[PDB]
Amino acid sequence: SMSYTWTGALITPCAAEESKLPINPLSNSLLRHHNMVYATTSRSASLRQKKVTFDRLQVLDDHYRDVLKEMKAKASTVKAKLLSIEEACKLTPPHSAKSKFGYGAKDVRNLSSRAVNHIRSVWEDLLEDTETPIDTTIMAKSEVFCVQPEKGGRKPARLIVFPDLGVRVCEKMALYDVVSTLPQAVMGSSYGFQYSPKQRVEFLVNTWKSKKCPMGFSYDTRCFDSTVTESDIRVEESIYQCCDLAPEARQAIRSLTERLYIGGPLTNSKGQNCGYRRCRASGVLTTSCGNTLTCYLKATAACRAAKLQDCTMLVNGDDLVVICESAGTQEDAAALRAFTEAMTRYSAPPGDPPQPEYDLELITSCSSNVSVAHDASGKRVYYLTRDPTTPLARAAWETARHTPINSWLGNIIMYAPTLWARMILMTHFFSILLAQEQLEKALDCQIYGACYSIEPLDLPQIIERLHGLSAFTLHSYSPGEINRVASCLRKLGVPPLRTWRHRARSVRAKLLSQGGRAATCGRYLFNWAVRTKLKLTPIPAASQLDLSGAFVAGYSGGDIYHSLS
């Protein structure tokens, strides 16, 4: 069975695609080696197609079957509610792709007669048709990176596949409660998306100290979505079907699985037949939940197959991490191979093969690793951080250009306590915002695939609840960490961390200069930037923040939105 078959029609762009950075006012203010920054375009689509296209052998053993039964037993506890038309509409991002039937996102959110009617008819059709493949668009995704050790070598665009707006809203009705609550009910503590960054590191740390001589590794799956099989996808259904369901929900799930999830026809932007898909669609509501379940399922079985001991897993979509019990260095190496052999049998071979690690800090997962720091009190505080190359590169892009999602805002939220987010990302963007009377203006960003609309002036409170007040006092970072950042700043041509200190003090002062929510930011976000530290008490408005459904589940590909009415 092939992951894809192609007809020859091209993956076409819908609009003008821009591949390089413009030389802008404040582009260079952040990053001067602009010819290292690039966005992906449909030009590289055929490259990615070569990569994701292959036949899949899959050989299930008894381990697998045991674990699946265990997962199903836990799902059987779940009661999933069917979403009302309205509730599904409110979960649609206002800039989600319009439907081919003469209405878009705002039509759905507004519950316009045309949209509501067709959404209804698409639901009706799910009951009345159990076989006909639902059509999908395929699109080359635009993402920004910096180039790395070849070079002149860029990633090819990733490929997104989605059904029409009307189907997407039906998916929500049928399956939004399922994908939001069943992962935790089945994998529990191993479901990564229930964890804030603070909560995540806490788990990882605890897990590590809980082992006597802990061993740890991450597992990278070679183009995961393509490795997913129709069998995988039906198994995933059998888990879903273990819930208590409304009768229409049950049929909806059965129909979407056959007509959409297991596979279907790929159509480009010009409306041409591009070929067929027999693997994970990356743009459906079930993508994150399916991926996480499938990963956790195959991972857990391949442990038993590898006779690994006292394993504990963190699973986030297709990203897997395992902290277990060391046997011996040569025995560990052998065990990790066995894990890989088995995963390869479950149709999940590796990107670059896994390597045991004996420092928690050297394990990467979710493009993240743990590092250590100290708060004002000198106490040893753990937090989570990445190589800032990709985040800064996109920070340069969003500076120059109008982008629908501000990854920088997201990254500051997720990586508040980090050295580079405080000294650069905050410093950079808060001068810009002040210099353009745009502090109160709320911007769109993503957390775990979901879209939120946030005012930058409510960053401290958000930051405090997600990380602690320590994230405003942290210092004495790791040498490896500080060397990673500084080395990155060379690469991109960013002003070295000395430089940013003075820029911050300016903005901080400029921010206190106005009092109110503005001053709260200068006082909290840029405390690192002064010798005479301010007193730092709790935030008044941290009290009543909406951080409901902020870190419950993953949704990358799911067309999900959680800001206000």
DSSP string, 475-486: BS--HHHHHHHH
Q: 331 with 467, same domain?
A: no
Q: 235 with 254, same domain?
A: yes
Element (H, E) at 430: helix 427-434
Q: 446 with 345, same domain?
A: no
Q: 346 with 381, same domain?
A: no
Binding residue ranges for Mg(2+)? 220, 318-319
Q: 361 with 390, same domain?
A: no
List Cα–Cα distances, 79 to 126, 205, 284, 292, in angstroms.
21, 33, 22, 20
SS3 455: coil
Residue 305 structure tokens: 């197959």
Domain boundary (367, 389, 418) is at 367
467 and 544 Cβ atoms separated by less than 8 Å: no
Please give the resolution of this entry in Å, rounded to 1 decimal.
2.5
What are the two backbone dihedrals, phi and then psi, of residue 445, each rounded to the nearest 5 degrees? Answer: -145, 170
**Helices (H), ranges, 309-420:** 329-345, 389-400, 407-414, 419-420
Q: 12 with 117, same domain?
A: yes
Domain boundary (367, 398, 430) is at 367
- Nearest CA to 173 out of 225, 107, 228, 127 is that of 127
Asked if the bond preceding 151 is cis, omega within 30° of 0, the reply is yes
**Which residues have CB under 8 Å from 11's CB, separation 6+?**
42, 45, 46, 49, 138, 139, 140, 159, 268, 274
Q: 229 with 317, same domain?
A: yes
Q: 234 with 98, same domain?
A: yes
- Nearest CA to 71 out of 334, 354, 336, 313 is that of 313
Report the 3 state secondary structure along 493-514: CCCCHHHHHHHHHHHHHHHHCC
- Nearest CA to 220 out of 335, 82, 81, 322 is that of 322
Domain boundary (337, 367, 397) is at 367
11 and 140 Cβ atoms separated by less than 8 Å: yes
Q: 202 with 303, same domain?
A: yes
Domain that holds residue 555: 368-565
Q: How wide is the angle at C-alpha 183 spanned by C-alphas 180 and 186, nearest 5°?
A: 140
365 and 295 Cβ atoms separated by less than 8 Å: no
**Which residues have CB under 8 Å from 384's CB, separation 6+?**
197, 200, 201, 368, 369, 370, 371, 415
Q: How many domains, in total, are found in the chain?
A: 2
Distance between CA 449 and CA 219 in Å, rounded?
Answer: 21
Centroid of chain to Cα 248 = 30
Q: Does residue 250 come out as left (phi exceeding 0), alpha (psi in the -120 to 50 range) or beta?
A: alpha
Distance between CA 217 and CA 354 in Å, rounded?
Answer: 7
Q: If 0-12 CB within 10 Å is exposed, 13-18 middle and 19+ buried, where does residue 90 land?
A: middle
Q: 116 with 179, same domain?
A: yes
Q: 260 with 313, same domain?
A: yes
Q: 159 with 199, same domain?
A: yes
Residue 179 CB neighbours (<10 A) = 27
Residue 146 structure tokens: 């910096």
Distance between CA 157 and CA 139 in Å, rounded?
Answer: 9
